Amino acid sequence: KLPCRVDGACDATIIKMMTDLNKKGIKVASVGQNYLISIPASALFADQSPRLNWASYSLLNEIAAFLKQFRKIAITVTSYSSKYVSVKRERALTLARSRVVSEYLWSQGVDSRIIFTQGLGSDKPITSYTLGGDRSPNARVEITFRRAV
């Protein structure tokens, strides 16, 4: 007579997806209700370009499937890139990357009232090892949100 859970979401599939994402080099982590999905940008875009590889749309499809399990209110997609040319260049590149990922995720309908976007360039690194291009550890895209109820 009444729904037995949130529509189209199974805990077993949630754990399976989290394990798979952690397996393929993507990072999925949960702290309380705060979920973080760290994407190595080497597996989403080309070298220092806001261009999605057509081979990476399977990865973004799996991500969008993962985000459809939880009932959230506001996602936040952010980007970070290694230092290439100048502050404006990587800031604009990260903003474009975040916009691309946001519009794709919003197109593959994930129920979220707001999807924020920001590009901080290389202002918040997570490693002291800056050697490398976008193969660098801290050239990534962070999709973070808080499960609602």
Partner 1 sequence: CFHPPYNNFQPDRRAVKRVGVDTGIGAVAGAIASGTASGTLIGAAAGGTVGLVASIYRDSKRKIIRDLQKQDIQYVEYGDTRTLIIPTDKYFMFSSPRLNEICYPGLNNVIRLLNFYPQSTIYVAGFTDNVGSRSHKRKLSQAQAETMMTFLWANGIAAKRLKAEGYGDKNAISDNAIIHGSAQNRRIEIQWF
Partner 2 sequence: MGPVCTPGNVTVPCERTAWDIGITALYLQPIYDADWGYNGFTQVGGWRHWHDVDHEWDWGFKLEGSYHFNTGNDINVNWYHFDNDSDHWFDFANWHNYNNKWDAVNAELGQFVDFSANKKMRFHGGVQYARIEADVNRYFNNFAFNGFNSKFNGFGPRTGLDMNYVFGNGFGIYAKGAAAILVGTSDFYDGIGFVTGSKNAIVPELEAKLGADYTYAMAQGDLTLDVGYMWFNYFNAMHNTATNGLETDFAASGPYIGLKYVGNV
Q: Kindly list the residues in this chain that would bind partner 1 in the complex (CB under 8 A).
A: 27, 29, 31-34, 36, 38, 125-128, 137-138, 146, 148-149
Q: 32 is in the binding site of which of partner 1, partner 2, none (Cβ under 5 to 8 A by kind)?
A: partner 1
**Nearest residue (CB) to partner 2, 25 versus 51:** 25
Among residues 6, 15, 19, 25, the one that binds partner 2 under rule CB under 8 A: 25
With contact defined as beta carbons under 8 Å apart, do 56 and 121 qualify?
Answer: no
Q: 23 is in the binding site of which of partner 2, partner 1, none (Cβ under 5 to 8 A by kind)?
A: partner 2
42 in contact with partner 2 (CB under 8 A): yes
CA angle, residues 72, 58, 22, in degrees to nearest 5 = 65
With contact defined as beta carbons under 8 Å apart, do 124 and 83 qualify?
Answer: no
38 in contact with partner 2 (CB under 8 A): yes
**Nearest residue (CB) to partner 1, 108 versus 125:** 125
Instruction: Give 36-63 as a DSSP string.
Output: EEEEEGGGTB-TTSS-B-GGGHHHHHHH
Query: Cβ 128 to partner 2, closest distance in Å?
Result: 8
- Dig out the tokens for 92 from the structure: 């604009």
Considering just the CA atoms, what is the radius of gyration of the chain in Å? 16
Torsion of the alpha carbons at 84, 36, 115 and 73, rounded to the nearest 10 = -170
- Interface with partner 2 (CB under 8 A): 23-25, 27, 38, 40, 42, 127-129, 135, 137
